[PDB]
Design a protein around this nucleic acid. Structure first.
Lengths: 84, 99, 55, 279, 219, 93, 98, 97, 97, 78, 108, 96
DNA sequence: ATCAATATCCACCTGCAGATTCTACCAAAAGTGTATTTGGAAACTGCTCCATCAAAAGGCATGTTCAGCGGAATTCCGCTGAACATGCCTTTTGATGGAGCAGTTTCCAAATACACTTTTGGTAGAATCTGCAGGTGGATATTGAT
DNA sequence: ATCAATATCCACCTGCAGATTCTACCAAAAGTGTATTTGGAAACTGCTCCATCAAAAGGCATGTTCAGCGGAATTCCGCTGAACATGCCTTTTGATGGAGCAGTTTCCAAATACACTTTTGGTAGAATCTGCAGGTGGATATTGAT
């Protein structure tokens, strides 16, 4: 079937982005940066998954693999190692 | 270009001359040492006469020894000023060839 | 005894010489000063400048 | 490769025989004989040995001709320039190239400045060393060719020589730098001072220090500080910053300061640094 | 070692400031040349056994001086002259117009100093002044058979030097003319002033020293 | 003999509004545009051919290269006119 | 009869044939359908020359200047980041006060 | 009863988190978010688990670089708290729009 | 005559310089500087004047982008005067080395 | 042959091309330093190109190739 | 003696043939010399024999006998010469170098 | 049922450079990705400059300037020194 | 300084996936010897283009005071994240199905390759005319002390 | 509130640079007519592998109070734009020398393409011995009230 889902950008939780900032090194977090860092996260996800789905669109693969998304993530100038 | 560019070498030649004159500031500062001693060497000559011979004949050695150190600053002060002065006019003699 | 009479001329020559050397001592003041007045052409940063070393 | 042989058998100047080390196209009238005399305070070489009965009477100048910068309790420093004084710039080189590996009378001796290392001696200021100075920042090379006379070598002068040249880097407020291309017996002593200035100026701040400010008070070229990392903990943070921090070491250099760190130079002296567009 | 038998005779002075002496080595020791022992073993052993002159060493300083003064800068075009000696009428304005490296500059200032008791008594000339007599005076009387000193000398050196030698637009520009010339004119008045004090310095010395010693027969 | 796209883009301006004009530096900037974007899509298409273990430089891979090489609405209009004109070329047999 | 006008485009297939070929790696190109990129350079070159006439009457100029090029080759936010490292020679910037 | 000073447990979690290198954001919510941002592109796309893990650590890398950016920005702006305009300058100066 | 407030003439020459597309830097000391940067890497190699114009087009494009980014950094700093730490943050957040 | 790293006060023209206000002091040394850095990077790339070509005169093709690698297209000049 | 002509004649420890046929694969132009590919061997080797030798210096100072992926990035990022050959690269599970700037902790 | 990788070769690099050091398979993939993309980078830059020289054959001097042009300073000079060493050492066609 | 309470280092420990060798094998490249066709190297040859070089009119960089507004230090005061409890939401884990992916084989369509025209597309000439930079001159804002 | 000397916007003129428009040589790739040739679109299946699912602790949401800090504002001073006079390197303009281009002809190193036949390096597993990883406790360093 279709199996549609309501968008859940609130899936990334408040202490999750807190821990992700504390990996970076910020010691004092604002109260209103939460929704906008969700926004820039969603923008980065859509900017990479457009390229992933067009690589799997040419591949004649109606799944995705790891190699095409590491190719697509290479060609956004932010190349990833480790997974091929 | 001939009567002009040589004036820059006149600048660098007399450049150390005020510092040479600053070395004379020690030399004219040296006159604080001995010309005041010249006032203070007089006190063992007239005060030792006292209403009239090792202090009257051999006292010239305290006087003849002091005239040696005054002369090094004296005449050497002149010729440095002369080579501060006189060598310009040969270059002026090049400048006298034109306006 | 004319011996010390002509020997006095060896010391009377110095006393006529005394007047011309004391005059050079007497001429010291203005030639120090009028050069220093000529040197003013500013605030006289020192006090014993060139020939005030002598007293 | 030309000067790999000997030219004079032995050369003296004053008190100490100097068996020379390098060939040079001198007049052959020097090489026909053995005794070569050199006039002490002025270095103007003597093809004959039969004039000190009158030339020392003709010896007019006793202080060596440079201009006084600073004298400590032991040693002084002098200043000779080429365009205003040519003749003592001549005879400085004729004793240098006997010891050296670089000199050639190719240009004129005018543009590059000369300093001096002469000690407080009771028979007038006898010279014990002299080191060159280029005029202004040609290829870096802010300090230049350094000589030290074997009449007074191996008695602890050369370290005092090189740091005084390095001491004039700070009033210059520029990047201090040696002539790179060759040094063998001096280069390890050259590398000694960058190690000597390494930990001594480090612990006096008692904290960290940023990479430009190393170049502020040490005033050396940053290639040396980058090559000083091989001796110590110069470690490199996020996108290049290279900044350092003290580690507890043996500090036996810093502990045993008794005789090897004998003297230094008080910064109390004057400089001109003349700007002239002649080059 | 015999290299330090009679080192040099002289006493130095200390400092209270920084020594500042920017001079010329070609003008520090004055004269340029010198000779060796093999030139006076003929004169002072074979010639002076019956001569009237009294030979001195100080005359060797200024001796050749007037002859190389013409051979270099008065005419430079000679290079390999076999008989390299210009003749007597080419050596007559040398001694009359005696240019001993600007001899006039070393004495014309002391005239208006009015210190004519002595001449040229400076520290940079060495301390042996009592034997100084100029051979602008001492040729026509005693230097007659010494006048031929240079004529023999270049023969055994083959016309070359006795010492060795190393291997060999107005406008907007005239304003610094008077701005530079006039400033160093005023230094003469500095020198002339400080001359007069160092004149009367020594004139104060000979005041009493010949007076009181005579008093033993008059009081 | 140098090859230049200058006459062709002059004819492009001719087939739009004819009143305007290329200058001697404007065709340099335009030639740089066409050569640069040609180079970009050509290396992307060949690299994608190598990525998909496939040999021929297909029209389908130029399709996916122009889909991944441009920003959005420019890409969809470009691929619309591209598929339009390539079916037009296949139409006239 | 034609050369590439049967594709309906303007640029030639033959110059873009070999320029696909000698730049290639995969050793074979589709010579009948390499003309799909021939389409795309037209849309490339029109869209950033159609905007040269986006300001015709409001610039009062007939030729296409290089400041006339860049100073409206930025308002096309779609074609902005298609030239994201382009440095137009003597094109100026766009006027802005923050 | 016992309570630390305010701001000193922050440096403790700084060193605890950056000393280690495990994945930070929770796995299955981000898998749900990848599928939910996927579903508007092509309906019912199959996924590979290692590809989802690649996305996990790739977006962790980009977001930790952005937090380094905003730490730089807030320490230049003589503050110690980050704000929205810090992220705005970080996005504007790093380069993407 | 009369003298308008300081700042206003500065902004009108902001406008006058920003409309113009003239090569802003003087050409012949730039020729001097590219010779100066040439001789320390290699002995005398020759420079086509069009290529020196190409450098004289590229490097001030890099400079004006640097100036734009440091202007935005200083207006983030709640001031209207750039400093040295402004250009330090601009280069470091740029990713310069 | 000498040092001519002093450019100009056209740093206060290039900043004027930016939308900047009153500039400061103590920036001119840093801006000529970063100019020296950028030029030494690009001239090092260009001299490697013209060394490989074994032509002793550089060309605009060399500098456009060097910039096209380096990260910014020297665009519309070659 | 030894006569093993397996193209270890260069003294290089990577295959000459695999990157030979990969250069013949990548091959935008037309031809590629194997004898001028032996230099391309050790370019790869010096990229690696100076990277991972520099890596295991952390294994002494952190007392590990293997080397794992956070041990890679923690020391493959300090060498600023080998920094910018990974600026496009993001190491998976590599962590961040410890970096707390001084003005963050001002003892307020 | 086929794959190509650089696994045992970098393992031998580790054995030469250090007497004992283990590698995880994740780190093997890290290093394999590094060697593969720096391979691709210098390969495409060398081919690009070979086209820009209007030559046709790829040889040692163009890959030499590729090494010299793709890296920063001191590892580039050590790399080109090692490259010249290796190409001269391969050039000796002899028995031993 | 002096303790209280954590926290960190420092072992010590037993089990568990996991690196390590490693034999087999089998594709499967690498290496080897031989024409061979061509492309790099090199020597040579016109020459176009680039490098100094000096002089002449003028923008323009340089130092100048100098007045002001923008940076910066310090104060004080509301508020908002921060530290921590806790009640509770859902994350993490083992079994069950279906289709997409990897793979084999087939015609078969489309592309290399040759070989032969020919419109077409650069280029040097070369008029030309016309749009544009600059100049001059008049109409309309432009932002200040009183 | 206002009248101002400055500056900008608009409008006509005028030299002049070069963009436009043929245009002919001319020669050159592009088009075309087959011929052969191999990679590829399509069909069938074995099988992982990836959805998709129901049962337990760890983290997340939501509070609390609370003091640390972001901002307002004052305040003060000093760096910094702003004319202004003045040196000064410029900005073409022209010319000389000359030399490192780009091109021809050339010739021989050499890389491609074979096929043979080789050892030989992934690799699936396959056993098999483990380093390490979380947990457990004990010595000692690092913040917080007095």
């Amino acid at each position: 079937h279709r199996k549609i889902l309501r968008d859940n950008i609130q899936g990334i939780t408040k202490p999750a982005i807190r821990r992700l900032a504390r990996r970076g090194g910020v010691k004092r977090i604002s109260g209103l940066i939460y929704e906008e860092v969700r926004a820039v996260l969603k923008s980065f996800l859509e900017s990479v998954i457009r390229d992933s789905v067009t690589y799997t669109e040419h591949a004649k693969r109606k799944t995705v693999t790891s190699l095409d998304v590491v190719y697509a993530l290479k060609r956004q100038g932010r190349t990833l190692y480790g997974f091929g | 270009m001939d009567p002009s560019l040589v004036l820059e070498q006149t600048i660098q030649d007399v450049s150390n001359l005020p510092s040479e004159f600053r070395y004379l500031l020690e030399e004219i500062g040296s006159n604080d040492l001995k010309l005041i001693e010249e006032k203070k060497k007089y006190e063992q000559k007239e005060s030792q006469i006292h209403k009239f011979d090792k202090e009257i004949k051999e006292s010239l050695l305290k006087c003849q020894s002091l005239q040696r150190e005054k002369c090094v600053l004296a005449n050497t002060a002149l010729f440095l000023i002369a080579r501060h002065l006189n060598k310009l006019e040969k270059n002026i003699a090049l400048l006298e060839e034109d306006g | 005894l004319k011996s010390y009479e002509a020997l006095k001329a060896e010391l009377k020559k110095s006393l006529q010489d005394r007047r011309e050397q004391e005059d050079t001592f007497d001429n010291l003041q203005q030639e120090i000063y009028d050069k220093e007045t000529e040197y003013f052409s500013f605030n006289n940063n020192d006090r014993i400048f060139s020939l005030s070393s002598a007293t | 490769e030309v000067a790999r042989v000997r030219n004079l058998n032995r050369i003296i100047m004053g008190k100490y025989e100097i068996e020379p080390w390098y060939f040079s196209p001198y007049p052959i009238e020097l090489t026909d004989e053995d005794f070569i005399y050199i006039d002490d305070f002025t270095l103007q070489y003597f093809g004959s040995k039969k004039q000190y009965e009158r030339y020392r009477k003709k010896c007019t100048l006793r202080h060596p001709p440079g201009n006084e910068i600073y004298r400590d309790d032991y040693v002084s420093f002098f200043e000779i320039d080429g365009r205003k004084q040519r003749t003592w710039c001549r005879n400085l080189c004729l004793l240098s190239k006997l010891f050296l590996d670089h000199k050639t009378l190719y240009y004129d001796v005018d543009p590059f400045l000369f300093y001096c290392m002469t000690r407080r001696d009771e028979l007038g200021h006898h010279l014990v060393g002299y080191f060159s100075k280029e005029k202004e920042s040609a290829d870096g090379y802010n300090v230049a060719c350094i000589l030290t006379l074997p009449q007074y070598q191996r008695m602890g002068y050369g370290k005092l020589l090189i740091e005084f040249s390095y001491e004039l880097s700070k009033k210059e407020n520029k990047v201090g730098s040696p002539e790179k291309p060759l040094s063998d017996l001096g280069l390890l002593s050259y590398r000694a001072y960058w190690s000597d200035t390494l930990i001594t100026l480090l612990v006096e701040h008692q904290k960290e220090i940023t990479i430009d400010e190393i170049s502020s008070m040490t005033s050396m070229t940053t290639t040396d500080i980058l090559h000083t990392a091989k001796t110590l903990n110069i470690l490199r943070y996020y996108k290049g910053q290279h900044i350092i921090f003290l580690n507890e070491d043996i500090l036996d250099r810093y502990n045993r300061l008794k005789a090897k760190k004998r003297r230094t130079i008080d910064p109390n002296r004057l400089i001109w640094k003349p700007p002239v567009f002649t080059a | 070692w015999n290299e330090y038998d009679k080192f040099y005779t002289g006493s130095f002075q200390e400092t209270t400031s920084y020594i500042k002496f920017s001079a010329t080595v070609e003008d520090c020791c004055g004269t340029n040349y010198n000779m060796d022992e093999r030139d006076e073993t003929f004169l002072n052993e074979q010639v002076n056994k019956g001569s009237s002159d009294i030979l001195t060493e100080d005359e060797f300083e200024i001796l050749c001086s007037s002859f190389e003064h013409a051979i270099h800068e008065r005419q430079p075009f000679l290079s390999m002259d076999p008989e390299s000696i210009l003749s007597f009428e080419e050596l007559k304005p040398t001694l009359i117009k005696s240019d001993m490296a600007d001899f006039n500059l070393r004495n014309q200032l002391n005239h208006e100093i009015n210190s004519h008791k002595t001449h040229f008594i400076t520290q940079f000339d060495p301390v042996s002044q009592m034997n100084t007599r100029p051979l602008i005076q001492l040729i026509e009387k005693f230097g007659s058979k010494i006048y031929d000193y240079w004529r023999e000398r270049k023969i055994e050196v083959n016309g070359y030097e006795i010492f060795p030698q190393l291997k060999f637009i107005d406008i907007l520009n005239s304003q610094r003319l008077r701005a530079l010339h006039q400033e160093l004119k005023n230094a003469k008045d500095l020198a002339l002033l400080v001359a007069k004090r160092e004149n009367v310095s020594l004139n104060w010395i000979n005041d009493e020293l010949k007076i009181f010693d005579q008093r033993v027969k008059i009081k | 003999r140098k090859e230049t796209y200058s006459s062709y883009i002059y004819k492009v301006l001719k087939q739009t509004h004819p009143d305007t004009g290329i200058s001697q530096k404007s065709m340099s900037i335009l030639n740089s545009f066409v050569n640069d974007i040609f180079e970009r899509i050509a290396t992307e298409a060949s690299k994608l051919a190598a990525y998909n273990k496939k040999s021929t430089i297909s029209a389908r891979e130029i399709q996916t290269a122009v889909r991944l090489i441009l920003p959005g609405e420019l890409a969809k209009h470009a691929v619309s006119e591209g598929t339009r004109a390539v079916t037009k070329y296949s139409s006239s047999t | 009869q034609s050369s590439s006008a049967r594709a309906g485009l303007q640029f030639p297939v033959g110059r873009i044939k070999r320029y696909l070929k000698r730049h290639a790696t995969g050793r074979t190109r589709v010579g009948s359908k390499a003309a799909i990129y021939l389409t795309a350079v037209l849309e490339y070159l029109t869209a950033e020359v159609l905007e040269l006439a986006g300001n015709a009457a409001k610039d009062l100029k007939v030729k296409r200047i290089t400041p006339r090029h860049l100073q409206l080759a930025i308002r096309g936010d779609d074609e902005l980041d298609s030239l994201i490292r382009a440095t137009i020679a003597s094109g100026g910037v766009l006027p802005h006060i923050n | 009863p016992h309570r630390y000073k305010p701001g000193t447990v922050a440096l403790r979690e700084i060193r605890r988190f950056q000393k280690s290198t495990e994945l930070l954001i929770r796995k299955l919510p981000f898998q749900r978010l990848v599928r939910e941002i996927a579903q508007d592109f092509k309906t019912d796309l199959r996924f590979q688990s290692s590809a989802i893990g690649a996305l996990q650590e790739s977006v962790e890398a980009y977001l930790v670089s952005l937090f380094e950016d905003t730490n730089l920005a807030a320490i230049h702006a003589k503050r110690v708290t980050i704000q929205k305009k810090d992220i705005k300058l970080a996005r504007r100066l790093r380069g993407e729009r």
